[PDB]
Chain length 191, copies 3
C-alpha cells in the first residue's frame, strides 16, 4: 500500500512536468499565430509600403558593433510578394558608408501566374519628418538575376541600392530623417 | 518526506492552473484581436452593426456596460486611427434621453507623419433599413480642443454628438432604425 | 492519499482542458487563414493544390472556397467546386458554382443579387483561359437574400472537360495545382 501510493505520487510528478512542456509549445504555437496576424496587419496590397523603424540609434550602434527584414507586402492581392532588407551600417559597395536598402522577392502563393523576371521599377524614400524633402533612390531590376526569377526558396537574395543614403547626412539639422528615435522608409513599386 | 512531495505538487498544480488560465486569456484576446482586424476599415467610412439592441439598451439602463467601443478604423492604411464610442442610454446632456455617439482619435503607428490637429469633417448616420430618412448629423471638430491634438496616450477624449438621436423614436413604428433587434451606425470621416 | 486523488483529478482536468485549448488554436488558425484568403473588390482567386489526389477522392463531395465579398459592406460569396462534377457534368466535367452567403450587412443591400459572374480556369502559360459567364436571373432562389447560412449554388455544370484538364497542351494543372478566378461585377 505504501510503495504504490508512492508510485502514484511519482507519476503525478511526471504528469505535471509533461503538462509544463505541452503548455510551453502551445504558447509558442500561439506566438507565431500572433506573428501571422501581425504580418497580415502590416501588409499593403497596392505596391506602396511604409516601414516605421523605432529605436534607431540603438540598432545603428549594434549594426556598427546586422540586417533587418520588413514585414511582407504585395504589388496586388494576387501580385508579387516582397519585403525589404535594411543594413543600418551598409552592405556591398556601401559596407560602412551608407544605409543599404534592398528589395527581396519572396515566393508568393500565386507565382505560377505572374511574369518572370520581376521587372517592376522600385522607388525608395527616406522620409523627412519636419520638412518635406525626402531622400529618394530608384531602380529597375537587373534582368533575370537569381534575385528576380520565381523563388524555389521562400526568399530570393536581395537586390537594390547599396548606397541609398550615407550615414553622415543622417542627422543633419537641415532634415528630420530621424525623429523621436524613429525613421520612416517608403517603398513604391509600380503596378 | 511524502508531506514535502504532496505539498510540492499542490504548489505546482496551482501554478499550472494559473498559467493555463493566462494561455486561455491570451488566446481569447488573440481571438478578439482577429475580429477587430476583420471589422477594421481603411477609407475613413465605418459601418457599425450593433445586435441585440433591446437587451443592450436595458443593459445600459442598469449601471451596467454603459458605453460601447467600436473596432478601430482608419482614414487610410497609414492615416489616422479612429474608433467610436456609443452610449446606448446616453451621456452628458443626453443621459437617459438620447443615444450619444462620439468619435475617438486614437494613437496611430504613423501619427508622426500626419497633420495635427486632426481636421476632417465627421458624419454620423443612424441608418433606416426600410427605405426611409436616416437620422444624420455631422460636425467639423474644433481646433482648440484636445480631442484633436496629437494623441499622447492611447486615446484622446471623445468628441461628438451627445444628443445625436432621441431614444423614444429609436424603435418607432414609422422608422426602421432597429429591425430584427439590430441597428446600423455609419460614420464617414471626410478624407481631405 | 485523498489529496493524492484530488491532485490526480486536477491534473487530468488540466490535460483535457489543454487539449480543448489545442482545438481552439486550430479553429482560430483557420479563421486567420480565411481572413488572408478574402478579397473585397469582387474578384477572387482560388488555388487548389494536390489535384490528382482530390480527383481520386472525388470519385471515392465538393470543395467550398474561402469567402470573398463584393465590397467591405457588400455581398458575402464563395465558390463550390465538384472536381468530379454535378448533374449534367457528373463524372465528366468540373462543376463550378457561385454561392451567395448570408452577409453581415444583407439587410442594407438590394435584393435580388444582380451582378454578373465570370468563371475562369487559368492556363498558367501566356494565353488561353477557359472563360464562362452568366448574369443572374431575378427569380431564381440562388440570388435573393439568404435566410440560412448559404443559398443554393448557381453556375456552370460542364464548365470544363475532366479529360482536357491534364492534357499536356495547356497548364490548367501544373505542379499538381490549378487556379480558378471568379470575377463579380460591381
Amino acid at each position: 500500500q505504501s510503495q504504490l501510493d508512492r508510485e502514484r505520487i511519482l507519476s503525478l510528478e511526471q504528469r505535471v512536468v509533461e503538462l509544463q512542456q505541452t503548455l510551453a509549445q502551445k504558447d509558442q504555437a500561439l506566438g507565431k499565430l500572433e506573428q501571422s496576424l501581425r504580418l497580415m496587419e502590416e501588409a499593403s496590397f497596392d505596391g506602396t509600403f511604409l516601414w516605421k523603424i523605432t529605436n534607431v540609434t540603438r540598432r545603428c550602434h549594434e549594426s556598427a558593433c546586422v540586417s533587418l527584414f520588413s514585414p511582407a507586402f504585395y504589388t496586388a492581392k494576387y501580385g508579387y510578394k516582397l519585403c525589404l532588407r535594411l543594413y543600418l551600417n551598409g552592405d556591398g559597395t556601401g559596407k560602412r558608408t551608407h544605409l543599404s536598402l534592398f528589395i527581396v522577392i519572396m515566393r508568393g502563393e500565386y507565382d505560377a501566374l505572374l511574369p518572370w523576371p520581376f521587372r517592376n521599377k522600385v522607388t525608395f524614400m527616406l522620409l523627412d519628418q519636419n520638412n518635406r524633402e525626402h531622400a529618394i533612390d530608384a531602380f529597375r531590376p537587373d534582368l533575370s538575376s537569381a534575385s528576380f526569377q520565381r523563388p524555389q526558396s521562400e526568399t530570393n537574395v536581395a537586390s537594390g541600392c547599396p548606397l541609398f543614403f550615407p550615414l553622415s547626412k543622417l542627422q543633419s539639422p537641415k532634415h528630420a530623417y530621424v525623429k523621436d528615435d524613429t525613421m520612416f522608409l517608403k517603398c513604391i513599386v509600380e503596378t
